[PDB]
């Protein structure tokens, strides 16, 4: 004999209470400017905290965090469609357009002291070559990728890294155990390029296994599965991805191979074949052709059904657009002279390398009202508390009282000290991180056909 185990209060789809109107609005940013060094930041020598020239390349994530003006602070000419005593107003997204205007062409990087031992494609004879230091200069193309994310919560990532060891055991080899983590994706941090989603800063002592841009960083990677499985669904509205790579060359490492390959698999040789070379091999991704029809931008994106339960409604008046491109990541060179003379010499010039990058944000929104009633206000309150606060209509006693007295003291800390805990709301949890911010509080409009999107929006909507 058994039983239906436990009734649990479920989450519900957001189209149950959110009501839509026939009022639309436009927003649009200006052209964004970004320029810097493709390899590393330029730090000031005297004070080593302020930057001189920042590091930016193609393979850094460009997370965007726009701001939205609160719709309740709008004096409308005809306030008859809603009551501000019983309702409130909040925005929802319906459109998306990301523009890039740089010409195509992939960027490249490298590393001057890369741990190449020998080429392992057609000829590696015996015996071993002499030397204690055999690092070489190599330059290397990257794999290509295209993606896009939108949502109300900033996107949550995941990466490998050094974690906890185990108990003192003499049977487990000196190998750092690998552990999964969950992180919030910052700006500037990198994407995988076929070398695993692990931190290279705390796992590679030699710093000679990747190109120079990704030795001391965490090449994070976006999670789909954990993010799709969030019950509230306020992180992923709508997303695409497209990537490709293939092998170009083959290489081996160099050094004391940490595990001897077992004798059960091979017959050992002699003469010139007494010693054994390495087994630590690694490829190089290069990337392939990039068409104009393999692009995922300069295209409208109409949304009518998100995969999560949030149907585009954005609490807190903020969005989160993250984009990764490599197709316009080309690298220009600069050549300035020191002296002018009529004969070429290799020390009269100086070289700097740079990289440019620009973006375009283009949006259309819809106005939505919430008829706040007693059975509904409890439903948001178990989801969040900040949205109920900044609407400025009420406050909450968090219990209905406690059940234990808990024995509060009164004589102020002179006999048996405890955790005093001076509190602070800290006004957001997101303030520790750093995003490319772009304001839009003076960039709304109601007349559509003076902008490219609303001209296209009127055709697909049939209005």
């Amino acid at each position, epitope marked *: 004999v058994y039983l239906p185990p436990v009734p649990v209060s479920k989450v519900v789809s957001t189209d149950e209470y959110v009501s839509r109107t026939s009022i639309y609005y436009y927003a649009g940013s200006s052209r964004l400017l970004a320029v810097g060094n493709p390899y590393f930041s330029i730090k000031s020598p005297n004070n080593n905290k302020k930057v001189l020239v920042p590091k930016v390349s193609g393979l850094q994530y460009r997370v965007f965090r726009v701001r939205l003006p609160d719709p309740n602070k709008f004096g409308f000419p005809d306030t008859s469609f809603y009551n501000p005593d019983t309702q409130r107003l909040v925005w929802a997204c319906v459109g998306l357009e990301i523009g890039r205007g740089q010409p195509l062409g992939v960027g490249v990087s490298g590393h001057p002291y890369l741990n190449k031992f020998d080429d392992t494609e057609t000829s590696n004879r015996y015996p071993a070559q002499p030397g204690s230091d055999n690092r070489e200069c190599l330059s290397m193309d990257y794999k290509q990728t295209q993606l896009c994310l939108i949502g109300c919560k900033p996107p949550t990532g995941e990466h490998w890294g050094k974690g906890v060891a185990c*108990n*003192n*055991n*003499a*049977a*487990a*080899t000196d190998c750092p155990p690998l552990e999964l983590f969950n992180s919030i994706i910052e700006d500037g941090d990198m994407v995988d390029t076929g070398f695993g989603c692990m931190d290279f800063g705390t796992l590679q002592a030699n710093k000679s296994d990747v190109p120079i841009d990704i030795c001391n960083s965490t090449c994070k990677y976006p999670d789909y599965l954990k993010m799709a499985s969030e019950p509230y669904g306020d992180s992923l509205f709508f997303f695409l991805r497209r990537e490709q790579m293939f092998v170009r060359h083959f290489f081996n490492r160099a050094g004391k191979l940490g595990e001897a390959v077992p*004798d059960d698999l091979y017959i050992k040789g002699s003469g010139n074949t007494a010693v054994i070379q390495s087994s630590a091999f690694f490829p190089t991704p290069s990337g392939s052709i990039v068409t104009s029809e393999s692009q995922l931008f300069n295209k409208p994106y109409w949304l009518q059904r998100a995969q999560g339960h949030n149907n585009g409604i954005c609490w807190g008046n903020q969005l989160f657009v993250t984009v990764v491109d490599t197709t316009r990541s080309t690298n220009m060179t600069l050549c300035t002279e020191v002296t002018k003379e009529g004969t070429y010499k290799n020390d009269n010039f100086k070289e700097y390398v740079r990289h440019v990058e620009e973006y375009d944000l283009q949006f259309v929104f819809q106005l939505c009202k919430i008829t706040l009633t007693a059975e509904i206000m409890t439903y948001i309150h178990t989801m969040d508390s900040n949205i109920l606060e900044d609407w400025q209509f009420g406050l909450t006693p968090p219990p209905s009282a406690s059940l234990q007295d808990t024995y509060r003291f009164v004589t102020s800390q002179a006999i048996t000290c405890q955790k005093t805990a001076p509190p602070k709301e800290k006004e957001d949890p997101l303030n520790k991180y750093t995003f490319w911010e772009v304001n839009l509080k003076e960039k709304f409009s109601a007349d559509l056909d003076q902008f490219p999107l609303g001209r296209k929006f009127l055709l697909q909507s049939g209005l």
Partner: antibody
Amino acid sequence: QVTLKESGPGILQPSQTLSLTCSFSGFSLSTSGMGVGWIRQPSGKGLEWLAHIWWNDDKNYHPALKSRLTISKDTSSNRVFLNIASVDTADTATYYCARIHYVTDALDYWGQGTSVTVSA
Amino acid sequence: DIVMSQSPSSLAVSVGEKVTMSCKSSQSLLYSSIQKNYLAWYQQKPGQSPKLLIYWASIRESGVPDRFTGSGSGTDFTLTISSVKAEDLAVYYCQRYYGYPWTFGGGTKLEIKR
């Protein structure tokens, strides 16, 4: 095939260093499959495990002591050496060095059983 | 540690008799995935060092005859000998190699009855 003998100082004083040397012939310790321990016994009491060191250079010790007991091998001469510092009156015993398996997970064939008695 | 306790300290057996020698522990020697009992046994002949008998509580060492057999599972264990002879006069020891650190038992002394 496997032959085994130990060698130690024999007579020690309190608060001195103990260098018990173990010697083997018949195998190599860097081979994947060979492994050795170190076991003591007094004349009257039973037996107890002290230290055991494996192929890939990691060490375990008896956690009651955990400080003085430092085991180390020399795979080039194919030997193990036992290094106890500050030998006290409780270490009056007869040590036994031998080779272990892990398909049997026990100590196969043992040696001479060198005697270390410490007094004034 | 996980302690080891053996009983009795000595047992007098005649020639041709079967001896049951019992050793116990405080924690069960079975693993949930390994499914082999983490136990082995020893034989300290007078004037000789201890030698190996049977491993994983049911699998014998090469050279030990069929008269020596190990049993027991969980926490109770007994070494079962079919018919004892002249050569088996010794001191036997219990060994658990399950949890680190490893320890020995109290031990038992076998004598031929006179």
